[PDB]
């Protein structure tokens, strides 16, 4: 056999994997996925930082969806502080949690199309992802890595201008998905590339802890919304895709359905935002308006403190799962009660998937393997860390 | 943007495109907008605001201990009720 290192350099490798294969003629035998080419080691870097400082790190792991990561932190921090946010903040966190979900699935769709050489949808839809980055920029001042979701809730109130254009934005989008409906969804070549590839039995999934659509494609119905409507999801209407064959075609159609599903939800979140603070009343966690801090003393005092040593969590080490579109997400805090975490492991949903890939690798030809990475929505940033 | 070209375009489209403008023209929204004023906040009342009630972090308690390292009709019991059967999509039963 012929030993062969692959990426990072391949566009298919996404600049991260080095899964060496000891190929035969072209059928694989050995196929080990090395990792640690991106390992930023943030676990110790989280430890020496005040809990408000930890917040950027999560935009830094899921490159695409962003607000959901920070929400994944605000839930896990508010648990230990036992703090329950004003409702408007949660309607917002769902609203941009779902728009982040649109960005993430558009990402996975069009890139998976690129490895299949489709080219066009990419350019047909990033024209839209700039349309959304215009929005995170309108609410954060940054096109991406917006810090707008916070443990107290949110940095700032929504500008008056959005509420119309966002509707306008989704006034037409369904058609843009129709344009895909007229492609890969029906297209002949596409089925052959993906049909009956990387099928996974329900048990291996339940063993490795597969989650999200990666379960839902092979028929396991496990979900992190309706099982635990941790926010406004309990009020929100939507319905969950489940695959049949475990075909990548299945998982695909699921993601398209979830995109439809956010088309359903975001409608209702636009339909239902209360007036109210988008932040907690407490100045011992949530900082004062610039107007009030510059007259009232105590506001300026606690202002000075949260921005210097910050709120103090009561001591405790805990773990929380998150409904990332990619799967269960890991928030393993270890806090001595000091604003510095003692430790903080972060389970990436894609970690288990990549652990499971080699099971799906062997006995498949290389194009199958290139199909597989796109099967699992894996942004490698979260995975090694 | 000529109308015959619009006809032939929508023709190939199988869809009206004029019905969902793709390129974002005139409507958009105004950049320069009148000031937000913002919500007043629930607990800015002056009559009462003792920290003893609004506080949340104060209620935190270390976990109840059972069995611990130091110090027959039992009826086998679930940790929590077992997961329920879901509905089948209902309004769109199949894709």
């Amino acid at each position: 056999n012929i030993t062969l290192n692959f990426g990072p350099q391949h566009p298919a490798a996404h600049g991260v994997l080095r899964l060496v294969m000891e190929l035969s003629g072209e059928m694989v035998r050995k196929c080990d996925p090395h990792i640690g080419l991106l390992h930023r080691g943030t676990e110790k870097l989280i430890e020496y930082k005040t809990y408000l400082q930890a917040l950027p790190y999560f935009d830094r792991l899921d490159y695409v969806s962003m607000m959901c990561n920070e929400q994944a932190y605000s839930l896990a921090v508010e648990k230990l502080l036992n703090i329950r946010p004003p409702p408007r903040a949660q309607w917002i966190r769902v609203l941009f949690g779902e728009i982040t979900r649109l960005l993430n699935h558009i990402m996975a769709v069009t890139t998976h199309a690129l490895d299949l050489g489709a080219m066009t949808p990419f350019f047909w839809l990033f024209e839209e992802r700039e349309k959304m980055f215009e929005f995170y920029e309108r609410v954060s001042g940054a096109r991406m890595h917006a810090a707008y979701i916070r443990p107290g809730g949110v940095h700032q109130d929504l500008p008056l201008g959005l509420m119309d254009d966002i509707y306008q934005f989704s006034k037409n989008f369904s058609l843009r998905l129709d344009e895909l409906e007229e492609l890969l969804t029906n297209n002949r070549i596409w089925r052959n590339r993906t049909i009956d590839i990387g099928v996974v039995t329900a048990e291996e999934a339940l063993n490795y802890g597969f989650s999200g659509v990666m379960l839902r494609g092979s028929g396991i119905q496990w979900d992190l919304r309706k099982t635990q409507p941790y926010d406004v999801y309990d009020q929100v209407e939507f319905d969950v895709p489940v695959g049949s064959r475990g075909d990548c075609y299945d998982r695909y159609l699921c993601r398209v359905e979830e995109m439809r599903q956010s088309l359903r939800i975001i409608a209702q979140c636009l339909n239902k935002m209360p007036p109210g603070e988008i932040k907690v009343d407490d100045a011992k966690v949530s900082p004062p308006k610039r107007a009030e801090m510059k007259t009232s003393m105590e506001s300026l005092i606690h202002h000075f403190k949260l921005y210097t040593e910050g709120y103090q969590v009561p001591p405790g080490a805990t773990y929380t799962a998150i409904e990332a579109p990619k799967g269960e997400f890991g928030v393993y805090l270890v806090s001595d009660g000091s604003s510095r975490p003692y430790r903080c492991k972060i389970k990436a949903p894609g970690f288990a998937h990549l652990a499971g890939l080699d099971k799906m690798s062997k006995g498949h030809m290389l194009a199958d393997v290139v199909a597989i990475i796109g099967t699992q929505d894996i942004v490698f940033g979260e995975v090694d860390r | 943007a000529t109308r015959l070209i619009q006809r032939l375009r929508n023709w190939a489209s199988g869809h009206d495109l004029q019905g969902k403008l793709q390129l974002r023209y005139q409507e958009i929204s105004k950049r320069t907008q009148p000031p937000p004023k913002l919500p007043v906040g629930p607990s800015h009342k002056l009559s009462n605001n003792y920290y003893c009630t609004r506080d949340g972090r104060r209620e935190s308690v270390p976990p109840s201990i059972i069995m611990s390292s130091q110090k027959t009709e039992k009826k086998a019991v679930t940790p929590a009720p077992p997961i329920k059967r879901w509905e089948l999509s209902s309004d769109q039963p199949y894709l």
Binding site: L158, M163, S174, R264, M273, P274 | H15, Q92
Partner: peptide
């Protein structure tokens, strides 16, 4: 003048696809 942006109305949108046979 208290305000912010709660919804102004919001008309119908269709998450449902259409794929005409034409």
């Amino acid at each position: 003048k208290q305000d912010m942006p709660p919804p102004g109305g919001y008309g119908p949108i269709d998450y449902k696809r259409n794929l005409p046979r034409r």
